[PDB]
Symmetry: C6
Subunit: 220 residues, 6 copies
């Protein structure tokens, strides 16, 4: 079948029927504070700690120092991983996609990375046609490189377009939606795997919490 | 000159819903949100043509590489690599440059493959890419040309397109369903926190079909619809 | 037709429609027929011409803007209608204004020439939407078309597209105001089932039944069921 | 020194709902979706004025030809050609084959020539269809000139939703002294016609929707208390 | 020195809801769809100031002529012509934009009539970019404040439960906001008044039903 | 392991919901429709800092004048003029007169140094921008500079719907480290005020809406 890499994010590998397909790109979309960055960091962190698979984290707005500081509260020492050459945080603050792809490819080769997180890829972008065009090019090259990639995207409603530009979910191999739904006056976080090309997966929404240990999903 | 004939898809349940299959020599639009089964439907159409009727097929891919189309079909126990090695399936790669729109050129290429592989079935996935660059009025007219030129070749064609809501416009520009002869809608609807897949034949010009939505699942044997 | 109404009508002979319209379509006027995709717009317009020819020997002109004459003819065989025979006999003319795989003045003259040449009493234009970008220019051009057909004395069915079952009548928000008569075909999806209805929204100068009436499309074309 | 007085429409039910009729010397906007009875309301207003009170009328049409107006009015038992012949009704044809100032002067000569007290303009929308700021200013000017002339005027406008904007540009209902809304509501596959007086500046009226039908004798509105 | 003082409207029910009336020396936005009672409220504010407190008023009108304002107020048994003749009320005709000039005219009228109360109806007429609307309205509000007027400014809106005014900014530069609604439900209309906000002071919350009668606005406590 | 430090607002109920207060050295977006208590929250933040912890504060105003801000705070029994006199509070008047972001930042930096304030409120930050993508770039720049200074900052923003976009341009909530939403929901003719902490990067907080009232004592939130 299709080989999958384990995220080791509690509950997620069950929902994805074994993890994220190796060598492919997964879109992780959500409104603000849904857990996008956390998912993308946990993906790299677990890869390093449990499988010694090095990772590249690409950030467009949040600084490397804040990413590191924020991860500290889950008890994750990212600076240590950076110091040991197992993690590389690529600062993409200030669009030349060619330059970005070359920088990513270089980091991947230099750190021998198997896992890549790009957070958020919507910061790369104004017509739908060109967004789709340029996103496709990024996805295609990471595939050629053989990276397994998480790309986060922003969205503005819980039920509504998958991402900002109405094309991102059609270009990605895999699509994960993080929701933070307000019901009555209470928030409930859920994760859904909408699509995984070429393989089976659990369907619909599953509740999760963010705790001191990161994302915890219960597929029941 | 006779009331339009149909070719069996052999996709279980679909030939009942369509009262005989897809109208021959015409295009059928298959529209749906992400991960609804559009590529799968279009592959299963060709695969069944080859296996059940020894009718060769041409698959036109605009985004996925042929290798990924092949890989993704293994999930269903379909050996597309062998079908390609045998000359029964041809995957026409129209996907673009990773490292660096002419419609009649595409038609030229499709027509050539159709003649070379003696193909009776064609899939184009996703059609959206043809009209991707541009106004609803422009999209409309470009889809019109493609449909017409495919009809001239005699191809029976499945063409897929995208939509972003389960119960909103048929496709993206609000014109695709008016230019198409035949329209199928794949939905993936939330009920509670669970999903329910359905297939609808909205229209088939000049012929009959069952109405409304019918539930289906995607399994290890592909699409399974229950009328 | 009931006697005490101001506007003379011609019968469509479409089962149930002449009841709902209280006698048929107003003579010498245009009737807008709008609907989402696959609602029966072309079928209604063809059935109007076919019945006119078959029942009253009234010749008809069909103006098609996207479907080819060959496909209109082919699809009509679904109903056991031999339109090629009527074209051969000079009783039906299909005017092909469909795109090569907009000059309205030239179009009107083609239509006029065909109507004179074939001595046609019934005209169908399918879809008039394709004639058209500002709502104001759509309105005056539609108005111009309607006025010329009226001067010519034709009785016309003009189909238009719409994208929601309940929502705008046509595409530009003006078509239903310029037309004398408005018919809406719906194909409502509810609880995973489709049901077709026809509504006569307005008919200037006469009464008509109000609201939605069910219909089906079968081997014999449109069948409408008027209810109390 | 008195609060504004009203002119009877003699449209069944309407003079009750408006507590006496349309405010005299002012314009009333009558808005509705397609086939709601706007032209009917605006004709019935003139027709009743002539028949019941010998008050001459001017009808300004921007789309429908005078011939079709006259023909369609026979549906309601009205012989408008006879009224035109007697010089009690004048139909001013402003329909297309827009200088508003010029049109206003032409309306004024008719009003003077036929000594009209009642005016209908149908639809005042089509004047405008070629910026809301411009629509507002031009409508205001037309309303003010009619008021100066002393006419009591019905102005129809189009709208595209039963329970949405009052008219097309989101400004008509603010520059009008009086607003009437004709609806044609579709519920459970049946249509229900209703009439509402939304506002009459400086005077009272009944509130909300009242059901009506169109008959061989025109509009019949049904109040109930 | 103190929390802000209020000036009584004497509009039945309103001084209760607002716990004393309108904040003195400030502007209150009064927003509403067509025929909600905006003009009536702004007239009744001036009329009561004159009749009850001998506080002169300036009414700024942008579309309705002074003659029609006066005529329409007869519906309530108010003789505004008399008050204008006595020098207690001035109807400033800004009918059929230079905001600086308008403001100097208002200032001139306030000085001339020693007015304490001002109504501007509708202030949206001044603006027919949301960014320029915001800056113009803020400028108008600040000058009125500097002059010392207590002001009612009405605005149009097009939905009962949508944006507060037309440009999506008017409620943010106003110190005080009142919304008049005329909600259609099951074929019946129901008028309500709501005090949405009064900066730096208290007020009752939500919608209160009111009617317009022969004697003006009556607000009922629910 | 290592927790994000927070400074107490001492606003009744808020420090419970935020599990300790606002993240120190960062900006917290406080968004809401008109009259939701945005300015009051901003002021109470600074006021409580001075009164309870002797932490000086800088209030940056963009429309309301200092005199009106002072006048309105009297509603709650707070004497801000006295605090300005004692050099404990500085009101930075950037309000209109009848836009250079770098100058403003330098003005704020100078005031922060001069008064050695730990707490800053910018009300409303929307006035800085009024294209969504340039708004995003500008707001980011402001957040970064304030962070560079070490200020703990409340930034208010406007929104026009109770359950729509967090703020006006659909980007402000993505650039901010922390996001608080004040709502004033109209249901069945009655209004209900609620506060929600939507997001605090790097740290925990209670979820959903909590009802509050505005009274003579300012904001009172009920975590129930
Ligand atoms: N130690 C913790 N314990 C509990 N919840 C935490 C903890 N750390 C962070 N969180 C929660 O996780 C959220 C942050 O998740 P992120 O992954 O940063 O979200 P995000 O979707 O990337 O949001 P952006 O980029 O700001 S739009 C915070 O808003 C908290 O609710
Ligand atoms: N063996 C399998 N069993 C069950 N479901 C499967 C299996 N293989 C694939 N799927 C499902 O099929 C979906 C993929 O269907 P596709 O036909 O590729 O969808 P699509 O509509 O073409 O989506 P795009 O092109 O990426 S937007 C996956 O998201 C899975 O849910
Ligand atoms: N023999 C038949 N029996 C039953 N239904 C039929 C038959 N032939 C055609 N139909 C139906 O009629 C529909 C076609 O109606 P049309 O008149 O072509 O619609 P249309 O409104 O003109 O749609 P367009 O032009 O494609 S948007 C098909 O989608 C079928 O559902
Ligand atoms: N004798 C009658 N009995 C009952 N209803 C009638 C009769 N005559 C006409 N009608 C109705 O009156 C409607 C037309 O009324 P109009 O006043 O023309 O409406 P309208 O709002 O002006 O429509 P426009 O201008 O075409 S959008 C028709 O659609 C019929 O429903
Ligand atoms: N004597 C009265 N008795 C009852 N209601 C009355 C009386 N006089 C006027 N009204 C009502 O008051 C309304 C007019 O209120 P206004 O204050 O003019 O509203 P408005 O919001 O200013 O409307 P505009 O400016 O036309 S959008 C009328 O539509 C009547 O419903
Ligand atoms: N003493 C008080 N008692 C009760 N409520 C009060 C008191 N003082 C003020 N308020 C309320 O506080 C609100 C003002 O809150 P603000 O913080 O000024 O709101 P805001 O969100 O900044 O509004 P803007 O800036 O005008 S959009 C008023 O509308 C009153 O409802
Ligand atoms: Cl959580
Ligand atoms: Cl499934
Ligand atoms: Cl049917
Ligand atoms: Cl009726
Ligand atoms: Cl009332
Ligand atoms: Cl409160
Ligand atoms: Mg993030
Ligand atoms: Mg696909
Ligand atoms: Mg058709
Ligand atoms: Mg009319
Ligand atoms: Mg008014
Ligand atoms: Mg404020």
């Amino acid at each position: 079948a299709i080989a999958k890499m384990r995220t080791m994010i509690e509950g997620f590998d069950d929902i994805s029927h074994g993890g994220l397909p190796i060598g492919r790109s997964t879109l992780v979309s959500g409104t603000s504070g849904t857990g996008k960055t956390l998912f993308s960091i946990q993906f790299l962190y677990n890869g390093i700690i449990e499988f010694d698979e090095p990772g590249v984290f690409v950030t467009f707005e949040e600084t490397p120092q804040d990413i590191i500081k924020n991860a500290r509260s889950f008890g994750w020492d990212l600076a240590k991983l950076v110091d040991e050459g197992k993690l590389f945080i690529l600062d993409a603050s200030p669009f030349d996609l060619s330059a970005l792809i070359e920088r990513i490819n270089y980091a991947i080769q230099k750190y021998r990375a198997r896992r890549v997180s790009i957070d958020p890829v919507t910061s790369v972008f104004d017509a739908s046609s060109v967004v789709r065009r340029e996103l496709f090019r990024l996805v295609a090259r990471l595939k050629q490189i053989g990276a397994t990639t998480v790309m986060t995207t922003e969205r503005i409603e819980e039920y509504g377009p998958i991402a900002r530009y109405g094309v991102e979910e059609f270009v990605s191999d895999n699509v994960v939606i993080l929701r933070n739904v307000l019901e009555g006056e209470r928030r409930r976080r859920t994760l859904e795997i909408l699509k995984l090309r070429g393989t089976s997966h659990m369907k619909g929404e599953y509740p999760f919490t963010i705790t001191d240990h990161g994302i915890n999903i219960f597929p029941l």
